């Protein structure tokens, strides 16, 4: 079969910036390639076909080049709405690329620390779930911990982070502390690092 | 307007069956080609299968070779799957897509894959269909800075996905992040949306998460307040 290989297989950058996500066939496959544009939840978009073709109604900071096998997609601009994963396809046998993600680059803020204790509802029924929420920060590189009367958490504890956003371009995040009521009986405190805080931040509460 | 509406997903155990379907509209449906994609969680698109108009010349991926068979029906306009000894690696969310016209063989005129359906889930697995419990992220001392409160819903335990949510039927958007749902080791998923408003507005408002899970035909909404 023909093989579809892509570089890099990530890229951050600035709004202005001109990228360049590379796209490569194992062998010739003319002019007959497609660009995809995927934003997370949501279906893909045809951006270029037949490699320089721009599909009606897509932003004209978008260009593609190259015939035979090696192929570039062209951002002349980098925009904030820009955030997604970009798929080259040969357009004979409909053989997808392993996807670009583009991340937008932007200036380091420091997330703001939310706490949430367990509802009376669910409490009710023997579980309980600690939230933690890390809001509006980037970039996505952090580390939550949990303490509970001061004693350090393992293995108890899943983290979520959104997509980018699309204006702003910053991440949150959610962690949640797992425990059964009967060990709930028993000061929480989420603390949080990252290159936005000087020293690190400890949200917490008492019962 | 030009639409490809998907059904037939679901939940259904290793080794056994199901069909999806695909409904067109806005086209000359007898004209085109179409084809099935997919994506499994986290992962890159991958083609399944294709088929041309009159139903001459079919397609499919190595993978799915013996087990998978692509039809049309086009009469119905409508585009089928039948997926057979269904393993690990078919669940995906599976995509219909619009192909290449009959009548224009270099694309002079038309261009393929630019219209796609909307997705639809299959899952995998021999574990139970179960409704998530929705419970309040109530917002307090410990969820504010400044003139900001954040509030939410947790939406915890449920089996397959999706579920959706939303805030007062649609009509506040603006400082949602619906978390992506994570699998808990018990099997089964979990996940938070909250929403930053105005601290002051605590008074004026009242703040509503809809939750859907249809694979379990459970609708919840939950007021949540200080």
């Known amino acids: 079969d023909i093989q579809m290989t892509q570089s890099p297989s990530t890229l951050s950058a600035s709004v202005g910036d001109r990228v360049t996500i590379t796209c490569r066939a194992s062998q010739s496959i003319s002019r007959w390639l497609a660009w995809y544009q995927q934003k997370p939840g949501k279906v893909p978009k045809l951006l270029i076909y037949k490699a320089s073709s721009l599909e009606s109604g897509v932003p004209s900071r978008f260009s593609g080049s190259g015939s035979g096998t090696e192929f570039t997609l062209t951002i002349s601009s980098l925009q904030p709405d820009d955030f997604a994963t970009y798929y080259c396809?040969?357009?004979?046998?409909?053989?997808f690329g392993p996807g670009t993600k583009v991340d937008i680059k932007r200036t380091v803020a420091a997330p703001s620390v939310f706490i949430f204790p367990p509802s009376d509802e669910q409490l009710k029924s023997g579980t309980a779930s600690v939230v933690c929420l890390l809001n509006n920060f980037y970039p996505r590189e952090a580390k939550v911990q949990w303490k509970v009367d001061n004693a350090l958490q393992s293995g108890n504890s899943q983290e979520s982070v959104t997509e980018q956003d699309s204006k702003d371009s910053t991440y949150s995040l959610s962690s949640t502390l797992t425990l059964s009521k009967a060990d709930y009986e028993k000061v929480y405190a989420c603390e949080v690092t990252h290159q936005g805080l000087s020293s690190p931040v400890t949200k917490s509460f008492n019962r | 307007e030009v639409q490809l509406v998907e059904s037939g997903g679901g939940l259904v155990q290793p080794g056994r069956s199901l069909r999806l379907s695909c409904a067109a509209s806005?086209?000359?449906?007898?004209?085109?080609?179409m084809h099935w994609v997919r994506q499994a969680p986290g992962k890159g698109l991958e083609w399944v299968s294709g088929?041309?108009?009159?139903?001459?010349?079919?397609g499919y991926a190595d993978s799915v070779k013996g087990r998978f068979t692509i039809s049309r029906d086009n009469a119905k306009n409508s585009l089928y799957l039948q997926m057979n000894s269904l393993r690990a690696e078919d669940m995906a969310l599976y995509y219909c897509?619009?192909?290449?016209?009959?009548?224009?063989?270099?694309?002079?005129?038309?261009?393929?894959?630019?219209?796609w359906g909307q997705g639809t889930m299959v899952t995998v697995s021999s574990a139970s269909t179960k409704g998530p419990s929705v419970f309040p992220l109530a917002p307090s001392s410990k969820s504010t800075s400044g003139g900001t409160a954040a509030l939410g819903c947790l939406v915890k335990d449920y089996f397959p996905e999706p579920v959706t949510v939303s805030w007062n039927s649609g009509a506040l958007t603006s400082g949602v992040h619906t978390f992506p749902a994570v699998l808990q080791s018990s099997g089964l998923y979990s996940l938070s949306s909250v929403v930053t408003v105005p601290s002051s507005s605590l008074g004026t408002q009242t703040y509503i998460c809809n939750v859907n899970h249809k694979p379990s035909n459970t609708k919840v909404d939950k007021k949540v307040e200080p």
């Open positions: 806005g086209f000359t449906f007898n004209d085109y080609a």
């Open positions: 396809q040969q357009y004979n046998s409909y053989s």
């Open positions: 897509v619009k192909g290449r016209d009959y009548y224009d063989s270099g694309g002079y005129f038309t261009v393929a894959f630019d219209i």
């Open positions: 088929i041309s108009w009159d139903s001459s010349s079919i």
